CSV table of C-alpha atoms and ligand atoms in Angstrom, one decimal:
chain,number,residue,atom,x,y,z
T,1,UNK,CA,20.1,22.0,-1.4
T,2,UNK,CA,20.0,21.7,-5.2
T,3,UNK,CA,18.9,18.4,-6.6
T,4,UNK,CA,21.7,16.4,-8.4
T,5,UNK,CA,20.6,14.8,-11.7
T,6,UNK,CA,22.7,12.0,-13.3
T,7,UNK,CA,21.1,11.4,-16.8
T,8,UNK,CA,24.2,9.6,-18.0
T,9,UNK,CA,23.6,6.9,-15.3
T,10,UNK,CA,19.9,6.7,-15.9
T,11,UNK,CA,20.1,3.0,-17.0
T,12,UNK,CA,22.8,1.9,-14.6
T,13,UNK,CA,22.2,-0.3,-11.6
T,14,UNK,CA,21.4,1.2,-8.2
T,15,UNK,CA,20.8,-0.1,-4.7
T,16,UNK,CA,17.5,-1.4,-3.4
T,17,UNK,CA,15.8,0.3,-0.5
T,18,UNK,CA,15.5,-1.5,2.9
T,19,UNK,CA,11.8,-2.1,2.1
T,20,UNK,CA,12.7,-3.6,-1.4
T,21,UNK,CA,15.2,-5.8,0.3
T,22,UNK,CA,12.6,-7.1,2.8
T,23,UNK,CA,10.2,-7.8,0.0
T,24,UNK,CA,12.7,-9.8,-2.0
T,25,UNK,CA,13.6,-12.0,0.9
T,26,UNK,CA,9.9,-12.2,1.8
T,27,UNK,CA,9.5,-14.5,-1.3
T,28,UNK,CA,11.0,-17.2,0.9
T,29,UNK,CA,9.7,-18.8,4.1
T,30,UNK,CA,10.2,-16.4,7.0
T,31,UNK,CA,9.7,-16.1,10.8
T,32,UNK,CA,6.0,-15.0,10.6
T,33,UNK,CA,4.7,-16.4,7.3
T,34,UNK,CA,5.6,-18.6,4.3
T,35,UNK,CA,7.0,-16.9,1.2
T,36,UNK,CA,4.8,-14.7,-1.0
T,37,UNK,CA,5.2,-12.0,-3.6
T,38,UNK,CA,4.4,-8.4,-3.1
T,39,UNK,CA,2.1,-7.4,-6.0
T,40,UNK,CA,-1.1,-5.4,-6.2
T,41,UNK,CA,-4.0,-6.6,-8.4
T,42,UNK,CA,-7.1,-4.8,-9.5
T,43,UNK,CA,-9.9,-5.9,-11.9
T,44,UNK,CA,-11.6,-3.1,-13.8
T,45,UNK,CA,-14.8,-3.2,-15.9
T,46,UNK,CA,-14.8,-1.1,-19.1
T,47,UNK,CA,-18.0,-0.5,-21.1
T,48,UNK,CA,-17.2,-0.5,-24.8
T,49,UNK,CA,-13.5,-1.2,-24.4
T,50,UNK,CA,-11.3,0.4,-27.1
T,51,UNK,CA,-8.3,-1.9,-26.9
T,52,UNK,CA,-6.2,0.1,-29.4
T,53,UNK,CA,-6.7,3.2,-27.3
T,54,UNK,CA,-6.0,1.4,-24.0
T,55,UNK,CA,-2.8,0.0,-25.6
T,56,UNK,CA,-1.7,3.5,-26.7
T,57,UNK,CA,-2.3,4.9,-23.2
T,58,UNK,CA,-0.5,2.1,-21.4
T,59,UNK,CA,2.6,2.2,-23.7
T,60,UNK,CA,2.8,6.0,-23.2
T,61,UNK,CA,2.9,5.4,-19.5
T,62,UNK,CA,5.7,2.7,-19.8
T,63,UNK,CA,7.8,5.2,-21.8
T,64,UNK,CA,7.0,8.0,-19.3
T,65,UNK,CA,7.8,6.2,-16.0
T,66,UNK,CA,11.3,4.7,-15.7
T,67,UNK,CA,10.3,2.3,-12.9
T,68,UNK,CA,7.7,0.6,-15.1
T,69,UNK,CA,10.8,-0.4,-17.1
T,70,UNK,CA,12.7,-1.5,-14.0
T,71,UNK,CA,13.9,-4.9,-13.0
T,72,UNK,CA,15.8,-6.5,-10.1
T,73,UNK,CA,19.1,-7.9,-11.4
T,74,UNK,CA,22.1,-9.2,-9.4
T,75,UNK,CA,20.7,-7.9,-6.1
T,76,UNK,CA,20.2,-4.4,-7.5
T,77,UNK,CA,17.5,-2.5,-9.5
T,78,UNK,CA,18.0,-1.3,-13.0
T,79,UNK,CA,15.9,0.8,-15.5
T,80,UNK,CA,15.8,-0.8,-19.0
T,81,UNK,CA,16.1,1.9,-21.7
T,82,UNK,CA,14.1,0.0,-24.4
T,83,UNK,CA,11.5,-2.6,-23.8
T,84,UNK,CA,9.2,-4.3,-26.4
T,85,UNK,CA,5.9,-2.5,-26.6
T,86,UNK,CA,3.2,-4.2,-24.5
T,87,UNK,CA,0.8,-5.9,-26.8
T,88,UNK,CA,-2.3,-6.5,-24.5
T,89,UNK,CA,-3.4,-10.1,-24.4
T,90,UNK,CA,-7.1,-10.4,-24.8
T,91,UNK,CA,-9.2,-13.3,-23.7
T,92,UNK,CA,-12.6,-14.1,-25.3
T,93,UNK,CA,-15.0,-15.3,-22.6
T,94,UNK,CA,-18.6,-16.4,-22.9
T,95,UNK,CA,-19.8,-16.3,-19.3
T,96,UNK,CA,-18.8,-14.4,-16.2
T,97,UNK,CA,-17.9,-17.7,-14.6
T,98,UNK,CA,-15.2,-18.1,-17.3
T,99,UNK,CA,-14.0,-14.6,-16.6
T,100,UNK,CA,-13.8,-15.4,-12.9
T,101,UNK,CA,-11.5,-18.4,-13.6
T,102,UNK,CA,-9.2,-16.0,-15.5
T,103,UNK,CA,-9.4,-13.5,-12.7
T,104,UNK,CA,-8.4,-16.1,-10.1
T,105,UNK,CA,-5.4,-17.2,-12.2
T,106,UNK,CA,-4.1,-13.7,-12.8
T,107,UNK,CA,-4.8,-12.4,-9.3
T,108,UNK,CA,-2.4,-14.9,-7.8
T,109,UNK,CA,0.3,-15.1,-10.5
T,110,UNK,CA,4.0,-14.8,-9.5
T,111,UNK,CA,5.8,-11.7,-11.0
T,112,UNK,CA,9.4,-12.6,-11.7
T,113,UNK,CA,11.3,-9.4,-10.8
T,114,UNK,CA,14.4,-10.4,-12.7
T,115,UNK,CA,12.7,-10.6,-16.1
T,116,UNK,CA,10.9,-7.6,-17.6
T,117,UNK,CA,8.1,-6.8,-17.3
T,118,UNK,CA,7.5,-6.8,-13.5
T,119,UNK,CA,3.8,-6.2,-14.2
T,120,UNK,CA,0.9,-7.8,-16.1
T,121,UNK,CA,-2.0,-6.3,-18.0
T,122,UNK,CA,-4.6,-8.3,-19.9
T,123,UNK,CA,-8.2,-7.9,-21.0
T,124,UNK,CA,-11.2,-10.2,-21.1
T,125,UNK,CA,-14.2,-9.7,-23.3
T,126,UNK,CA,-17.4,-11.2,-21.8
T,127,UNK,CA,-20.3,-11.7,-24.2
T,128,UNK,CA,-23.0,-9.1,-23.6
T,129,UNK,CA,-21.1,-7.7,-20.6
T,130,UNK,CA,-18.5,-5.0,-20.0
T,131,UNK,CA,-15.0,-6.0,-20.8
T,132,UNK,CA,-12.6,-6.8,-17.9
T,133,UNK,CA,-9.1,-5.3,-17.4
T,134,UNK,CA,-6.8,-7.2,-15.2
T,135,UNK,CA,-3.9,-5.2,-13.9
T,136,UNK,CA,-1.0,-6.5,-11.8
T,137,UNK,CA,1.6,-4.1,-10.4
T,138,UNK,CA,4.4,-4.9,-7.9
T,139,UNK,CA,4.9,-2.9,-4.7
T,140,UNK,CA,8.5,-4.0,-5.0
T,141,UNK,CA,8.9,-1.3,-7.6
T,142,UNK,CA,5.9,1.1,-7.2
T,143,UNK,CA,4.6,2.1,-3.7
T,144,UNK,CA,1.0,2.7,-2.8
T,145,UNK,CA,1.1,6.4,-3.7
T,146,UNK,CA,2.9,5.6,-7.0
T,147,UNK,CA,0.1,3.2,-8.0
T,148,UNK,CA,-2.5,5.8,-7.3
T,149,UNK,CA,-0.6,8.2,-9.5
T,150,UNK,CA,-0.3,5.6,-12.3
T,151,UNK,CA,-3.9,4.4,-12.0
T,152,UNK,CA,-5.2,8.0,-12.2
T,153,UNK,CA,-3.0,8.7,-15.3
T,154,UNK,CA,-4.2,5.5,-16.9
T,155,UNK,CA,-7.8,6.5,-16.3
T,156,UNK,CA,-7.1,10.1,-17.5
T,157,UNK,CA,-5.2,8.9,-20.6
T,158,UNK,CA,-8.0,6.6,-21.6
T,159,UNK,CA,-10.6,9.3,-21.2
T,160,UNK,CA,-8.5,11.9,-23.0
T,161,UNK,CA,-6.2,10.1,-25.4
T,162,UNK,CA,-5.3,13.2,-27.4
T,163,UNK,CA,-3.5,14.9,-24.5
T,164,UNK,CA,0.3,14.5,-24.3
T,165,UNK,CA,2.2,14.9,-21.1
T,166,UNK,CA,5.7,16.5,-21.1
T,167,UNK,CA,8.5,14.2,-19.8
T,168,UNK,CA,9.2,14.0,-16.1
T,169,UNK,CA,12.3,16.2,-15.1
T,170,UNK,CA,13.3,13.9,-12.2
T,171,UNK,CA,13.9,10.2,-11.7
T,172,UNK,CA,13.5,7.8,-8.8
T,173,UNK,CA,17.1,6.6,-9.3
T,174,UNK,CA,18.5,10.1,-8.8
T,175,UNK,CA,16.2,10.6,-5.7
T,176,UNK,CA,17.8,7.7,-3.9
T,177,UNK,CA,21.3,9.0,-4.9
T,178,UNK,CA,20.7,12.4,-3.2
T,179,UNK,CA,22.8,13.2,-0.1
T,180,UNK,CA,19.8,13.6,2.2
T,181,UNK,CA,19.0,9.9,1.9
T,182,UNK,CA,22.5,8.9,3.1
T,183,UNK,CA,23.0,11.2,6.1
T,184,UNK,CA,20.9,8.6,11.5
T,185,UNK,CA,21.8,11.1,14.2
T,186,UNK,CA,19.9,11.1,17.5
T,187,UNK,CA,17.1,9.1,15.8
T,188,UNK,CA,18.9,5.8,16.3
T,189,UNK,CA,19.6,6.7,20.0
T,190,UNK,CA,16.1,7.9,20.6
T,191,UNK,CA,14.6,4.6,19.3
T,192,UNK,CA,17.0,2.5,21.3
T,193,UNK,CA,16.1,4.5,24.4
T,194,UNK,CA,12.6,2.9,24.4
T,195,UNK,CA,13.0,-0.7,23.2
T,196,UNK,CA,11.7,-1.8,26.6
T,197,UNK,CA,8.4,0.1,26.0
T,198,UNK,CA,7.4,-1.5,22.6
T,199,UNK,CA,4.9,-4.4,23.2
T,200,UNK,CA,4.6,-7.3,20.7
T,201,UNK,CA,2.4,-7.3,17.7
T,202,UNK,CA,-1.3,-8.0,18.4
T,203,UNK,CA,-1.7,-11.5,19.8
T,204,UNK,CA,-4.7,-12.4,17.6
T,205,UNK,CA,-6.2,-15.9,17.7
T,206,UNK,CA,-4.9,-18.1,14.9
T,207,UNK,CA,-6.1,-21.3,13.5
T,208,UNK,CA,-2.6,-22.6,12.7
T,209,UNK,CA,1.0,-21.7,13.0
T,210,UNK,CA,1.7,-18.9,10.5
T,211,UNK,CA,4.9,-20.6,9.4
T,212,UNK,CA,2.8,-23.7,8.5
T,213,UNK,CA,1.2,-21.8,5.6
T,214,UNK,CA,3.3,-22.7,2.6
T,215,UNK,CA,1.5,-20.6,0.0
T,216,UNK,CA,-0.2,-17.6,1.6
T,217,UNK,CA,-3.2,-16.3,-0.2
T,218,UNK,CA,-4.6,-12.9,0.5
T,219,UNK,CA,-8.3,-11.9,0.7
T,220,UNK,CA,-10.0,-8.5,0.9
T,221,UNK,CA,-12.8,-6.9,2.9
T,222,UNK,CA,-13.5,-3.4,1.8
T,223,UNK,CA,-15.8,-0.6,3.1
T,224,UNK,CA,-16.3,3.1,3.1
T,225,UNK,CA,-17.4,5.9,5.4
T,226,UNK,CA,-19.8,8.3,3.7
T,227,UNK,CA,-18.6,11.9,3.0
T,228,UNK,CA,-21.0,13.4,5.6
T,229,UNK,CA,-19.8,11.0,8.3
T,230,UNK,CA,-16.1,11.4,7.3
T,231,UNK,CA,-16.3,15.2,7.4
T,232,UNK,CA,-18.0,15.0,10.8
T,233,UNK,CA,-15.5,12.5,12.1
T,234,UNK,CA,-12.6,14.7,11.1
T,235,UNK,CA,-14.2,17.6,12.8
T,236,UNK,CA,-14.7,15.6,16.0
T,237,UNK,CA,-11.1,14.6,15.8
T,238,UNK,CA,-9.9,18.2,15.6
T,239,UNK,CA,-12.1,19.1,18.5
T,240,UNK,CA,-10.5,16.2,20.4
T,241,UNK,CA,-6.9,17.3,19.5
T,242,UNK,CA,-6.4,14.2,17.3
T,243,UNK,CA,-5.5,13.8,13.6
T,244,UNK,CA,-7.9,11.8,11.5
T,245,UNK,CA,-5.3,9.0,11.2
T,246,UNK,CA,-5.0,8.8,15.0
T,247,UNK,CA,-8.8,8.4,15.3
T,248,UNK,CA,-8.9,5.6,12.8
T,249,UNK,CA,-5.8,3.9,14.4
T,250,UNK,CA,-7.6,4.2,17.7
T,251,UNK,CA,-10.9,2.8,16.6
T,252,UNK,CA,-9.1,0.0,14.8
T,253,UNK,CA,-6.9,-0.7,17.9
T,254,UNK,CA,-10.0,-0.8,20.1
T,255,UNK,CA,-11.4,-3.7,18.0
T,256,UNK,CA,-8.0,-5.4,17.9
T,257,UNK,CA,-7.7,-5.1,21.7
T,258,UNK,CA,-11.0,-6.9,22.3
T,259,UNK,CA,-9.6,-9.9,20.3
T,260,UNK,CA,-6.0,-10.1,21.3
T,261,UNK,CA,-4.5,-12.0,24.2
T,262,UNK,CA,-2.9,-8.8,25.5
T,263,UNK,CA,-4.6,-5.4,25.3
T,264,UNK,CA,-1.5,-3.5,24.5
T,265,UNK,CA,0.3,-4.1,21.2
T,266,UNK,CA,2.4,-2.5,18.4
T,267,UNK,CA,1.4,-1.8,14.8
T,268,UNK,CA,3.6,-1.2,11.8
T,269,UNK,CA,2.6,2.0,10.0
T,270,UNK,CA,3.3,2.3,6.3
T,271,UNK,CA,3.7,5.9,5.1
T,272,UNK,CA,4.4,7.3,1.6
T,273,UNK,CA,5.4,10.9,2.0
T,274,UNK,CA,8.5,12.0,0.2
T,275,UNK,CA,11.4,14.3,1.0
T,276,UNK,CA,10.8,17.5,-1.0
T,277,UNK,CA,14.1,17.4,-2.9
T,278,UNK,CA,12.7,18.4,-6.3
T,279,UNK,CA,9.4,20.3,-7.0
T,280,UNK,CA,8.0,17.5,-9.1
T,281,UNK,CA,9.1,14.6,-6.8
T,282,UNK,CA,5.4,13.8,-6.1
T,283,UNK,CA,4.7,13.0,-9.8
T,284,UNK,CA,7.1,10.0,-10.2
T,285,UNK,CA,6.8,6.3,-9.6
T,286,UNK,CA,9.1,4.4,-7.2
T,287,UNK,CA,9.4,3.1,-3.6
T,288,UNK,CA,9.3,5.9,-1.1
T,289,UNK,CA,7.8,3.8,1.7
T,290,UNK,CA,8.8,4.5,5.3
T,291,UNK,CA,7.9,2.0,8.1
T,292,UNK,CA,7.3,3.2,11.6
T,293,UNK,CA,6.2,1.3,14.7
T,294,UNK,CA,3.3,2.7,16.8
T,295,UNK,CA,2.2,1.2,20.1
T,296,UNK,CA,-1.4,1.1,21.5
T,297,UNK,CA,-1.7,1.3,25.3
T,298,UNK,CA,-5.3,1.3,26.4
T,299,UNK,CA,-6.3,3.7,29.2
T,300,UNK,CA,-9.5,4.4,31.2
T,301,UNK,CA,-11.3,5.9,28.3
T,302,UNK,CA,-11.0,5.6,24.6
T,303,UNK,CA,-10.2,9.3,24.4
T,304,UNK,CA,-7.3,9.0,26.8
T,305,UNK,CA,-5.7,6.2,24.9
T,306,UNK,CA,-6.4,7.9,21.6
T,307,UNK,CA,-4.8,11.1,22.8
T,308,UNK,CA,-1.9,9.1,24.2
T,309,UNK,CA,-1.5,7.4,20.8
T,310,UNK,CA,-1.6,10.7,19.0
T,311,UNK,CA,1.3,12.1,21.2
T,312,UNK,CA,3.3,8.9,20.5
T,313,UNK,CA,2.5,9.2,16.8
T,314,UNK,CA,3.8,12.8,16.7
T,315,UNK,CA,7.1,11.9,18.4
T,316,UNK,CA,7.7,8.8,16.4
T,317,UNK,CA,7.2,10.7,13.1
T,318,UNK,CA,10.1,12.9,14.0
T,319,UNK,CA,12.4,9.8,13.8
T,320,UNK,CA,11.4,8.0,10.7
T,321,UNK,CA,15.0,8.1,9.3
T,322,UNK,CA,15.4,5.0,11.4
T,323,UNK,CA,13.0,2.6,9.9
T,324,UNK,CA,10.8,0.0,11.7
T,325,UNK,CA,12.9,-2.6,10.0
T,326,UNK,CA,15.9,-1.6,12.1
T,327,UNK,CA,13.9,-1.1,15.3
T,328,UNK,CA,12.6,-4.7,15.0
T,329,UNK,CA,16.2,-5.9,14.8
T,330,UNK,CA,17.1,-3.8,17.8
T,331,UNK,CA,14.1,-5.2,19.6
T,332,UNK,CA,15.1,-8.8,18.8
T,333,UNK,CA,18.6,-8.2,20.1
T,334,UNK,CA,17.4,-6.6,23.4
T,335,UNK,CA,15.1,-9.6,23.9
T,336,UNK,CA,17.6,-12.3,22.7
T,337,UNK,CA,15.1,-13.8,20.3
T,338,UNK,CA,15.8,-14.5,16.6
T,339,UNK,CA,13.2,-12.0,15.4
T,340,UNK,CA,10.4,-9.7,16.5
T,341,UNK,CA,7.8,-9.6,13.7
T,342,UNK,CA,5.1,-7.0,13.2
T,343,UNK,CA,2.6,-8.6,10.9
T,344,UNK,CA,-0.4,-6.3,11.6
T,345,UNK,CA,-0.1,-3.2,9.4
T,346,UNK,CA,-1.8,0.2,8.9
T,347,UNK,CA,-1.3,1.8,5.5
T,348,UNK,CA,-2.4,5.4,5.0
T,349,UNK,CA,-2.7,7.2,1.7
T,350,UNK,CA,-4.4,10.2,3.2
T,351,UNK,CA,-3.2,13.7,2.4
T,352,UNK,CA,-1.6,13.2,-1.0
T,353,UNK,CA,-3.9,15.3,-3.2
T,354,UNK,CA,-5.2,12.2,-4.9
T,355,UNK,CA,-8.8,13.5,-4.7
T,356,UNK,CA,-11.3,11.5,-6.8
T,357,UNK,CA,-8.9,8.6,-7.1
T,358,UNK,CA,-11.1,5.7,-8.4
T,359,UNK,CA,-14.0,8.2,-8.6
T,360,UNK,CA,-17.5,6.8,-9.1
T,361,UNK,CA,-17.9,7.8,-12.7
T,362,UNK,CA,-14.5,6.4,-13.9
T,363,UNK,CA,-14.4,4.7,-17.2
T,364,UNK,CA,-12.1,2.1,-15.7
T,365,UNK,CA,-14.5,1.0,-13.0
T,366,UNK,CA,-12.7,-0.9,-10.2
T,367,UNK,CA,-14.8,-4.0,-9.2
T,368,UNK,CA,-12.4,-6.4,-7.4
T,369,UNK,CA,-8.9,-6.3,-6.0
T,370,UNK,CA,-6.3,-7.8,-3.7
T,371,UNK,CA,-2.8,-7.0,-2.5
T,372,UNK,CA,-0.1,-9.2,-1.0
T,373,UNK,CA,2.7,-8.2,1.4
T,374,UNK,CA,5.3,-10.7,2.8
T,375,UNK,CA,5.4,-11.4,6.5
T,376,UNK,CA,2.1,-9.5,7.0
T,377,UNK,CA,-1.1,-11.2,8.4
T,378,UNK,CA,-3.4,-8.2,8.2
T,379,UNK,CA,-3.0,-4.9,6.4
T,380,UNK,CA,-5.6,-2.1,7.0
T,381,UNK,CA,-5.3,0.3,4.0
T,382,UNK,CA,-7.1,3.7,3.9
T,383,UNK,CA,-7.4,6.5,1.4
T,384,UNK,CA,-9.8,9.4,0.7
T,385,UNK,CA,-11.8,9.8,-2.6
T,386,UNK,CA,-14.7,12.0,-3.5
T,387,UNK,CA,-15.0,13.3,0.1
T,388,UNK,CA,-15.4,9.6,1.2
T,389,UNK,CA,-13.1,7.5,3.4
T,390,UNK,CA,-12.4,4.2,1.7
T,391,UNK,CA,-10.7,1.3,3.4
T,392,UNK,CA,-9.9,-2.3,3.0
T,393,UNK,CA,-8.4,-5.1,5.1
T,394,UNK,CA,-6.0,-7.4,3.2
T,395,UNK,CA,-5.2,-10.5,5.1
T,396,UNK,CA,-4.2,-14.1,4.9
T,397,UNK,CA,-7.5,-15.8,5.2
T,398,UNK,CA,-6.1,-19.2,6.1
T,399,UNK,CA,-4.4,-17.8,9.3
T,400,UNK,CA,-7.5,-16.9,11.2
T,401,UNK,CA,-10.5,-18.9,12.6
T,402,UNK,CA,-13.5,-18.8,10.2
T,403,UNK,CA,-15.6,-15.7,10.6
T,404,UNK,CA,-13.1,-13.9,12.9
T,405,UNK,CA,-11.7,-11.3,10.5
T,406,UNK,CA,-15.2,-10.8,9.0
T,407,UNK,CA,-16.5,-10.2,12.6
T,408,UNK,CA,-13.8,-7.7,13.5
T,409,UNK,CA,-14.4,-5.8,10.2
T,410,UNK,CA,-18.1,-5.7,11.1
T,411,UNK,CA,-17.4,-4.4,14.6
T,412,UNK,CA,-14.9,-1.9,13.2
T,413,UNK,CA,-17.3,-0.5,10.6
T,414,UNK,CA,-20.0,-0.2,13.2
T,415,UNK,CA,-17.8,1.5,15.7
T,416,UNK,CA,-16.5,3.9,13.0
T,417,UNK,CA,-20.0,4.9,11.9
T,418,UNK,CA,-21.4,5.3,15.4
T,419,UNK,CA,-18.4,7.5,16.6
T,420,UNK,CA,-19.0,9.7,13.5
T,421,UNK,CA,-22.7,10.1,14.5
T,422,UNK,CA,-22.7,9.7,18.3
T,423,UNK,CA,-20.9,12.1,20.6
T,424,UNK,CA,-20.9,9.6,23.6
T,425,UNK,CA,-17.6,7.8,23.2
T,426,UNK,CA,-15.6,11.1,23.0
A,1,NA,NA1,1.5,-5.6,-2.2
C-alpha cells in the first residue's frame, strides 16, 4: 500500500479523531468528572539561558511541525500556513517564591483550541538562580509520543543550534486520510462477544462525588526504578512469560485491588504506536492515541493473575481498531445505564526508541510537571530513559481521601522494588 500525499489540501480542514472529540467534550461537565482541559505542562531549569537561541529553536520547530500550527475550528482541525513568530514572554523574578506563583498560574491556564496558538511557552529569570522555562502543550493536538519527540528536538536544537533538519516528508493530516484508517471487521463482534466479562473501573474510596468537582486540578507523584532493578525486573518478566508492561500493570493492579471495593476491575490502556504507512511516520507530531480496555481478575497467586492478564492483553491488542470509547458505549447499552466510565488509566511510552528522553545531563532540566485528562481520576504514566524506568501518577487530588493516593504510591513503589530484587512473589 503506497502512501497518498495531498499537499494541495495541507491547510484544509480535516476530521478530529475519536480521542480528540472526547477531549473537546471533556471541557464540559461529564458523567465522571467536571470539565477540564487536556494539556501537558513542564517546568525546565536552564543555566545561562540564551533567550535568542531558545527563540530560534522554538520557531524552527513551529515551522517544521504542522500540528504546532493547528487549531480546532468549526468542529474540525486545521493547520494554519502562516503564524506570527512566537516572541517568548520573559518574566523578571527576584525570589523562587515569585517564580512559584508564576508557575502555578501557567500550569493551570486554559488553552483555547480555537485561537492559535494552542500552546504556551514563557521564561522566568530568577536572580542568582537558573532561569525557568514554562512549556504548555495540548494532548488534544500532540499525543504523548509526539511530545517526547518535540521535547527531544527542543533539547537537541538548543544544544546544537547550528544543525538544520530537512523538512518532514509526511503529515499527520494525510495519515488520517489514508484508507487503512477507514476500513471494523470481526473486531466489533469480538468485543461485543464479551461485554458481560468486563468489570467496572476500580471502586476506589472517594472523599466526594466526582461530578461535584467543578474545577478539577491535577497533581503529580513521580518515581523511578533504577536501571539495575529495571533490567532485572524485565528479565524476571521474560522468565515468567510476561511482557514488562504486563508486570507493571499487574503490580499496579495488586495495589489497586487492596483499596477497591471489588477486587476485579477494568483499566483503560493508552497506547501510542502508529500504523507503519510511511517510513518516517514515527517522526511527526499528532494524535495517534489508541484506547483499549484491560481487565484485572485476581487469582490464587500474583503470577497466575499476571499471566492471565498478559493473555488477555495479547488478545485485546489484536482488536484495537475498535477503541475503548466504543466498547464503553457498548457496555452502557448492555447494562442500560447512561454511561460506563473508565477513569483509571495506564499510559505506556515504552518501546518507542526515545532512549535518553529527559536525560540527566540535559540543558533543559525538567524539575516539575503536571498533565490533565478529562474524565480521568488517576493516570499512571510510564516511560524508559537512560536504562531507568520512570513513572508518575497524575490524579485529581480533591477526589481522594487525604493521604490515600500518596499511600498507594508508596506501596506500589515498595512492591515494584522488592519484586525486582526478591524472587519470592514469582
Ligand atoms: Na493531558
